[PDB]
Amino acid sequence: MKLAPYILELLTSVNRTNGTADLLVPLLRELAKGRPVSRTTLAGILDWPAERVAAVLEQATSTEYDKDGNIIGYGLTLRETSYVFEIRLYAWCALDTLIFPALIGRTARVSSHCAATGAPVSLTVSPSEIQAVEPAGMAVSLVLPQEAADVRQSFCSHVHFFASVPTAEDWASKHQGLEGLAIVSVHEAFGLGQEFNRHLLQTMS
């Protein structure tokens, strides 16, 4: 798997803080209800002390909070982005939309616009496959996650959908200052997501 460096670095962003992996799925599953999630609700769901819940979250600097300090964004978010994820929620980046359905056990209708051209793109993402990929040649950009950097800025903001591989490569050609920038087909990107989830689940206690 020549996408192994991306999977390794993705999992690295999770495995480091002892609890992050075990907090992730429960949090996504809640956020998927479409409402803000309090630290005490989360703590109850995880059967953790609040101090532990707060520790893990403190490491996740990109976490989005509402006016009451309820969590509203952690990969999956209630606040509008370029990546629509209907089960109408939003995701931080293209790869998120490919990974989450398996983790939350739902099929999502995903839509966005090509980063290079603005053209509409959509697909349906289930826990096991992607279907109704429009356009058929849809592509995704990847960068290598940068350890300890803000994940939303260093990774998510560079991980897009494109109308086609050639269109994405043209775009990539003008952005070579990004670390480990790579263009893959959306089907390749989904497979990377599957590898990520398969490992993530093993590391969950």
- For the question of residue 93 being annotated catalytic, the response is yes
Measure Cα distances from 73 to 24, 113, 127, 176 in Å.
12, 21, 21, 29
- For the question of residue 114 being annotated catalytic, the response is no
The residues near 15 (Cβ < 8 Å, ≥ 6 apart) are 21, 203
The string of DSSP codes covering 1-43 is -TTHHHHHHHHHHHHSSTTHHHHHHHHHHHHTTTS-B-HHHHH
The residues near 90 (Cβ < 8 Å, ≥ 6 apart) are 76, 77, 78, 79, 80, 81, 83, 84
- The alpha carbon torsion through 181, 144, 201, 14 (nearest 10 deg) reads -150
Measure Cα distances from 113 to 6, 73, 166 in Å.
24, 21, 16
Measure Cα distances from 199 to 21, 28, 98 in Å.
10, 17, 15
Catalytic member of 96, 114, 150, 170: 96
Which of 50, 75, 51, 55 minimizes the C-alpha distance to 64?
A: 75
Which of 108, 109, 101, 94 minimizes the C-alpha distance to 127?
A: 101
Q: H helices of 119-179, where?
A: 151-154, 165-173
Contact between 36 and 71 (Cβ < 8 Å) = yes
Catalytic member of 93, 114, 150, 170: 93
Contact between 83 and 89 (Cβ < 8 Å) = no
Q: How far is CA 95 from the centre of its chain?
A: 5
Backbone φ and ψ for 188, nearest 5 degrees, come out as: -60, -40
Q: In 102-147, which ranges are E strands?
A: 108-113, 120-125, 130-134, 139-142
As assigned by CATH, the class of the 1-205 domain is alpha beta
Report helix, strand or coil for 97.
helix
Measure Cα distances from 67 to 36, 37, 74 in Å.
10, 12, 16
- Strand ranges of the sheet holding 76-77, from the earlier edge strand across to the other edge: 64-65, 71-74, 76-77, 89-91, 83-86, 108-113, 120-125, 130-134
- The alpha carbon torsion through 52, 53, 57, 59 (nearest 10 deg) reads 10
Asked if the bond preceding 5 is cis, omega within 30° of 0, the reply is no
Which of 109, 25, 31, 21 minimizes the C-alpha distance to 65?
A: 31
- For the question of residue 22 being annotated catalytic, the response is no
CB atoms near residue 52 (< 10 Å) = 14
Structure's resolution in angstroms: 1.8
